[PDB]
Amino acid sequence: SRRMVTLEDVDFLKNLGVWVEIYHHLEKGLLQQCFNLVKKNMEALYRQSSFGWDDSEKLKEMEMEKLEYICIFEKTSKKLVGFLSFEDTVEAGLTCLYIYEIQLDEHIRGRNVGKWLLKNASILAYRRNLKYIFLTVFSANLNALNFYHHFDFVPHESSPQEKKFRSGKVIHPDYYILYTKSRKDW
């Protein structure tokens, strides 16, 4: 058929039939649910990268004390449908919120929930006197790459760069390090 930590704008989620919670640490059950979303969304991308995928390794990462979680659940099912995780840190001398994950279940993508999570992360960062937002992204993840570009992320000086030599050597990095300034006004 090809030719026919007070969060902002919570009312937006209410209008979608979802709600948000902030976690300092994930409880055992929810840890497993978030892991399931990351694995479902990302396993293939991790596999094809130099980083690889290890279930046990991703799990331990998500348990790290430094990571804070913003989680969105469906009002009817009370199931997790998305989250954003981050740490407050420093990157090359710059104070930042470093995003580890932004993950949405398939059925809730493309409805401005990604924007909602990113915007709130950015606001939180600014209010914590964190001047930048940083993240890593796979070069092969084209949708995410363009999503970030739209929200003014650009490669940090520390990001790997494309390189081509007359010798025939071609270097395509499998990830970028992106950043942008945090902002309180959206």
Ligand X SMILES: CC(C)(COP(=O)(O)OP(=O)(O)OC[C@H]1O[C@@H](n2cnc3c(N)ncnc32)[C@H](O)[C@@H]1OP(=O)(O)O)[C@@H](O)C(=O)NCCC(=O)NCCS
Residues 55, 110, 127, 163: which binds ligand X (CB under 6 A)?
A: 110
How far is Cα 143 from Cα 141, in angstroms, rounded to an integer? Answer: 6
Q: Which of 41, 85, 103, 141 touches Cl ion by CB under 5 A?
A: 141
Classified as helix, coil or strand, 113 is helix
- What residue type is assigned to position 141 of the chain? N
Stretch near ligand X under the rule CB under 6 A, chosen from 89-97, 105-113, 160-168, 169-177:
105-113
Applying CB under 5 A, the span of 109-117, 137-145, 162-170, 176-184 interacting with Cl ion comes to 137-145
- Which DSSP symbol is given to 159? S
Least Å from the CB of residue 86 to ligand X = 11
Q: Which is nearer to ligand X, 103 or 182 (CB)?
A: 103
Four-CA torsion 101, 105, 110, 113, nearest 10 degrees:
-60
- From the CB of 38, what's the least distance to Cl ion, in Å? 11
Which of the ranges 22-30, 47-55, 68-76, 107-115 carries the binding residues for ligand X, by CB under 6 A? 107-115
185 — alpha (psi -120 to 50), left (phi > 0) or beta? Answer: beta
Point out which residues pair with 181 in neighbouring strands: 132
72 versus 130: smaller Cβ distance to ligand X: 72
Handedness of CA 89, 133, 81, 56 (dihedral sign): negative
Using CA atoms, how far apart are residues 3 and 1, in angstroms rounded to an integer? 6
Report the residue number whose CB is nearest to ligand X.
114
- The site for ligand X (CB under 6 A) is made up of 41, 101-104, 109-115, 141, 143-144, 146-147, 150
